[PDB]
Structures are given as structure tokens and as C-alpha cells.
Amino acid sequence: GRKKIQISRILDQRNRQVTFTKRKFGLMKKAYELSVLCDCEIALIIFNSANRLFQYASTDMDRVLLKYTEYSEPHESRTNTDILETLKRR
Amino acid sequence: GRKKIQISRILDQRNRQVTFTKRKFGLMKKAYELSVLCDCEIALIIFNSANRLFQYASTDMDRVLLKYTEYSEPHESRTNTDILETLKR
Amino acid sequence: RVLFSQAQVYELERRFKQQRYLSAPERDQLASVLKLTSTQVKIWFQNRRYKSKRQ
DNA sequence: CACTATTTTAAGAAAGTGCTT
DNA sequence: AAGCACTTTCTTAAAATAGTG
């Protein structure tokens, strides 16, 4: 808040690290809210610029990943590229 | 929202489904923003009430899961239980 | 814990565009006009200088 | 989907801390 | 004393969203 920021790589390492920790909490909080509100199983895996791991799971990471491996059907499967296109068209 | 909602299972099937699709887009949007802003590799796997799968990955799901497979180092690992405690400020 | 007025900040910023650093007397003179303390102008300029490099 | 009142998120501002000259 | 490098606490504008046809 206070000024609109463009969605592009933050140039300044320290700014990048503060923004990262803020938005990581925000993302895990929203994941938690969704899981509880809509009774869903969510897994979130984050690797930062320094390749350090941070993970959230609603119930248990292993259970969700097992259910994922043995889904055996087409599903909504999005990348940064596909997302960029979906946002530009609105 | 027009009303503040408490964080509990929505007990109205149709409301649950509309809230789900809204907040799933919002979550994937924030995941995308984080990935681009902070140069991060993110994987997001969501199973709804009906056990239907929805997934986002910054670049490629398999690459992130591989990197996650071989990684035995003390890292932040959060569940709904741990989150509940952390939210009491 | 209170933020400065947009008139205070307008003059602080206008002055910062001319000079990144103030002398103690210069600082006191400005503080008087803006209705701030010497400490407040000092630390404002310190913070603004830091943020300028974090662009 | 659109609308929009209202809530929630996170960027940025002042002050705190700690070290150097 | 004042500079700089963070860090911390809080405010507030931007973004998300609940309730609704």
C-alpha cells in the first residue's frame, strides 16, 4: 500500500528479502483460509532466490503429494507464462 | 467484503463453491506475483471438497518437486495446526 | 506515533532535491519553519538518504 | 461474470538499535 | 554528534473479497 508497484523482479536484494518474507506469510495465510473455508487439501512449496525451502500443507505434505502422484487425469495446470497471458487479456 | 467472515468451514455448498473459485484465483495470482517480484520457484497443489485437482507452478511442477524430494535441511514447515497458534498475535 | 503533514513532507522533499545533506544551523532553521525538531529533520534526512539508494 | 461496500494485505514512513569516525 | 546500516512498529493506500443479481 501507498503507491502501485509493477509486477517485475525487485532489483534491490534487501527490498527483495523484506517483500519476500511479507508476501510468503500473506500467501500461507490465504492458503490456510482457503483450506478451512472450502474444506480443501493444499500443499505450497517455495524456494527463494537463495534456494532455501519454505513449505505449508493443510493436513500433511506427504498425504497431498501421494494423492497428487496417483490422480491419473487431466487437471488445471498453470505456469508463470500461462498466467501472464490470462492477466493481459482482462 | 460487505461482511467480515470468521475462518470456519462454509456450511452452504453453493457459497463454498463460489468462495473456492474466487480465493483459488486470488491465491494463484499472489503465488505468481511472489514468483516474479522475488525471483522464487513456487508449486501450489489444491484438492477441493470433491477431490478435483488444481495446480500452479512458477516454471515446472516436476522440477520444483524434484528439488524438494532431495532436501534434508531444517526449513520452515507449516500446517493448519501450527498456523492456528501463530495467528494469536 | 504520528506521520508529518504533506506540507512538512513537500518542503522536506523540495529541500532534499537541492541538498542531500544539511549543516546543523541549516537543519535548525528548517525545523523552525516546518514546526519540527532538529532530531526529526536530522533523522528524516538520514532515512530519505537510505531510501534514495534502495531507490 | 459485474458491482461495490467493506475487509485485508503489504509498501512505506518514522523511530529504534548499534557501530564507526 | 552525525553518519550509515539495518530493524521494528504502525499507517494507510492498494488489492482482495462477501454478498448479491
Contact C54 A15 (CB under 8 A): yes
Measured between alpha carbons, how far is A64 from B43 in angstroms, rounded to an integer?
Answer: 13
User: Chain-centre distance of CA C33, in angstroms?
Assistant: 12
B69 φ, ψ (degrees, to nearest 5): -60, -60
- Å resolution of this model? 2.9
Q: How was this structure determined?
A: X-ray
Asked if residue C55 keeps its beta carbon closer than 7 A to nucleic acid strand D, the reply is no
Q: Exposed (0-12), middle (13-18) or buried (19+): which is B35, by Cβ within 10 Å?
A: buried
Q: What residues have CB less than 8 Å from C34, skipping those under 6 apart?
A: C4, C8, C11, C12, C41
CB atoms within 10 A of CB C26: 13
Q: If you measure CA to C1', which residue is closest to nucleotide E19?
A: B2
Query: How many Cβ atoms from other residues are within 10 Å of residue B60's Cβ?
Result: 12
Which letter, b or e, does each residue of C7-20 get, where b requires 16 or more Cβ atoms within 10 Å of its Cβ?
ebeebbeebbeeee
Q: Tell me how far the alpha carbon of residue B62 is from its chain's centroid.
A: 18
Q: What are phi and psi of A57, to 5 degrees?
A: -140, 140
The one-letter amino acid at A1: G
* C-beta within 7 A of nucleic chain D, residues 20-59 of A: 22-23, 25-27, 29-30, 33
Cβ separation C55–A14 shorter than 8 A: no
Q: Is the CB of C3 under 7 A from strand D?
A: yes
Beta bridge partners of A56: A44, B78
